[PDB]
Amino acid sequence: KKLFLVFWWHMHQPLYREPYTGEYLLPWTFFHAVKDYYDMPAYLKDFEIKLNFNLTPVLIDQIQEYAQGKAKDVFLEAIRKDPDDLEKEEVEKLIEFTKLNYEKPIYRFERIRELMNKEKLNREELLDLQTLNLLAWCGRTLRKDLKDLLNKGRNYTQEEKEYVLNKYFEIIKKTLSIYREIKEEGKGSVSTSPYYHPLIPILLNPNCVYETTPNVKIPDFAVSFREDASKHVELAKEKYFEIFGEHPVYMWPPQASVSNEALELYYEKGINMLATDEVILKNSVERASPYLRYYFRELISVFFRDKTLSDLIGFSYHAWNAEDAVRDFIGRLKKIHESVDFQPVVFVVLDGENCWEYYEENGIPFLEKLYSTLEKEEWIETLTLEEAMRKEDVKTEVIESVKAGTWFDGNFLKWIGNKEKNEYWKILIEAKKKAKNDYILVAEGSDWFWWQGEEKAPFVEVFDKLFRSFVRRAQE
Numbered sequence: 477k478k479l480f481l482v483f484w485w486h487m488h489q490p491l492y493r494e495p496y497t498g499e500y501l502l503p504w505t506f507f508h509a510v511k512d513y514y515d516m517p518a519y520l521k522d523f524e525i526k527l528n529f530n531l532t533p534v535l536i537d538q539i540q541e542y543a544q545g546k547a548k549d550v551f552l553e554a555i556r557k558d559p560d561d562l563e564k565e566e567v568e569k570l571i572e573f574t575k576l577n578y579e580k581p582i583y584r585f586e587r588i589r590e591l592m593n594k595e596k597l598n599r600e601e602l603l604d605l606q607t608l609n610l611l612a613w614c615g616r617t618l619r620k621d622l623k624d625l626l627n628k629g630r631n632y633t634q635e636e637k638e639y640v641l642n643k644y645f646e647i648i649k650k651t652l653s654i655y656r657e658i659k660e661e662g663k664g665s666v667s668t669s670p671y672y673h674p675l676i677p678i679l680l681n682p683n684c685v686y687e688t689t690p691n692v693k694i695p696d697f698a699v700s701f702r703e704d705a706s707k708h709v710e711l712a713k714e715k716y717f718e719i720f721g722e723h724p725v726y727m728w729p730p731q732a733s734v735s736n737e738a739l740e741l742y743y744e745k746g747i748n749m750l751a752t753d754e755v756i757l758k759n760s761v762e763r764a765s766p767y768l769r770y771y772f773r774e775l776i777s778v779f780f781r782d783k784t785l786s787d788l789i790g791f792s793y794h795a796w797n798a799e800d801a802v803r804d805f806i807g808r809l810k811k812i813h814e815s816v817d818f819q820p821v822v823f824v825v826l827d828g829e830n831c832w833e834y835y836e837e838n839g840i841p842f843l844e845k846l847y848s849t850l851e852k853e854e855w856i857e858t859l860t861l862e863e864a865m866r867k868e869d870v871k872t873e874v875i876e877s878v879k880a881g882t883w884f885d886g887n888f889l890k891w892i893g894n895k896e897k898n899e900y901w902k903i904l905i906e907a908k909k910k911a912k913n914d915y916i917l918v919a920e921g922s923d924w925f926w927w928q929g930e931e932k933a934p935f936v937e938v939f940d941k942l943f944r945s946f947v948r949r950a951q952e
């Protein structure tokens with residue numbers, strides 16, 4: 477009697493490439509590529525477990541651009557430059573970026589503390605600010621190779637900065653290949669999402685917000701996004717075919733978002749299985765065990781993730797010692813294992829690149845201890861998505877209807893509802909009336925609405941600039 481454990485790490489970035497200048501206006505795709513996107517599947521090289529991954533096609537596009545040397549990244553150019561050639565604006569954006577990440581454990585360098593107490597920086601101090609920002613995002617693989625430079629902590633030269641950059645781009649160049657390798661070796665399944673990570677339920681039927689938040693105000697959806705919804709899925713199938721050689725049979729719905737109509741569309745497009753959130757299941761069915769494989773209308777397989785276990789990694793364990801956190805995690809799986817007489821399937825699903833920056837040492841002590849302890853447990857069998865879809869000694873249930881929602885409170889309020897987010901949908905709706913190319917699909921990505929209508933934060937202007945630029949470009 478085994479507990480079946482399914483890790484599904486979801487990787488995504490919206491398109492930071494501004495369509496008129498061709499410039500990557502934020503460096504987040506680069507920094508999460510060198511820190512997490514290669515290194516997360518790379519754990520499978522050292523640990524005999526199964527781990528699954530989601531790669532959005534818009535993320536894949538940017539990884540390709542960086543890997544091929546075509547990405548003009550404005551922040552990264554400020555990093556690469558000799559400090560004597562830095563513009564005042566570039567120094568300000570460098571300092572701004574440091575302040576934003578300053579309290580995170582991966583930025584725990586004494587020299588960063590010294591430099592941010594300084595009101596004017598010379599060439600050597602700017603070289604340290606540039607290079608330590610690079611090194612703060614160093615992933616597990618290169619933290620071994622670059623350990624001498626990392627322990628330095630200060631006094632970096634342009635030659636050393638350039639060396640780190642060359643190693644980082646080598647990491648990026650091998651990133652798509654290692655997803656292909658762990659997939660071909662059976663160490664994990666790889667899924668994708670509709671192309672630009674949109675909210676498929678809203679594009680299909682904006683009225684589905686009223687299944688959870690009946691009081692919410694939405695704009696006049698005077699155009700249909702239903703065909704655009706199909707296009708996100710179809711284009712995603714094409715990009716996945718290019719990278720991995722098959723049409724995808726697993727998809728992660730952006731924000732875990734599902735509806736009766738969205739599940740229909742996924743089935744119609746040949747998706748055999750997806751996962752969503754436990755809150756959906758609780759909102760939809762009275763007797764709701766998340767340890768079963770569900771069949772929506774006998775059309776498509778649905779797993780409901782263990783929200784508690786997913787939220788321990790995403791939200792709790794960063795503030796713990798690695799050893800305490802893994803003993804807690806295994807202790808919870810043991811109680812699940814001891815709680816039922818059948819073999820439960822336990823889906824752990826969350827973003828794969830966003831939580832580790834808040835852990836000590838980028839979560840490497842935690843994940844190494846976690847994966848080491850998992851592979852020693854005889855009563856735990858980690859599964860690929862393919863193995864979870866096919867496993868016969870697993871309990872099964874049919875569900876006929878779900879309440880539309882997301883894994884954020886089970887509703888859509890993080891992307892629609894208040895004046896400012898609704899203004900984005902107004903802009904999108906008007907632009908869709910006049911759209912002439914697929915940049916309208918880029919503007920349907922969920923990220924733009926997430927950051928809109930929120931307390932002012934540094935760089936929120938860039939997401940707004942990107943969204944409006946994609947909207948403008950879509951109509952030309």
Ligand SMILES: OC[C@H]1O[C@H](O[C@H]2[C@H](O)[C@@H](O)[C@@H](O[C@H]3[C@H](O)[C@@H](O)[C@@H](O[C@H]4[C@H](O)[C@@H](O)[C@@H](O[C@H]5[C@H](O)[C@@H](O)[C@@H](O)O[C@@H]5CO)O[C@@H]4CO)O[C@@H]3CO)O[C@@H]2CO)[C@H](O)[C@@H](O)[C@@H]1O
Nearest residue numbers: 486487488489490504731827830922923926931933934935
């Ligand atoms: O404002 C108060 C608030 O601020 C702080 O949050 C800030 C972060 O700490 C800071 O680093 C920065 O966040 C960045 C982020 O680091 C950067 O990587 C990028 O985020 C990407 C994700 O990396 C990417 O995975 C994707 O995220 C999706 C995800 O795929 C999906 O599954 C789901 O979870 O939604 C996510 C969002 O759509 O895309 C995003 C970009 O859209 O960009 C971020 C913004 O610059 O800035 C944050 C805001 O200031 C504190 O951390 C927080 O506690 C404070 O309360």
Ligand SMILES: OC[C@H]1O[C@H](O[C@H]2[C@H](O)[C@@H](O)[C@@H](O[C@H]3[C@H](O)[C@@H](O)[C@@H](O[C@H]4[C@H](O)[C@@H](O)[C@@H](O)O[C@@H]4CO)O[C@@H]3CO)O[C@@H]2CO)[C@H](O)[C@@H](O)[C@@H]1O
Nearest residue numbers: 783786787790791794825826827830831832834883884885
């Ligand atoms: O900025 C603060 C935090 O940043 C990081 O958190 C990330 C997570 O890593 C991502 O996975 C994602 O979080 C998802 C989350 O996985 C999903 O379960 C859901 O979580 C709900 C949760 O059930 C609920 O109980 C409550 O705690 O709020 C969550 C949000 O409603 O939805 C999340 C949003 O997509 O993104 C967050 C950042 O938003 C980092 O890991 C944290 O340490 C950090 O505090």
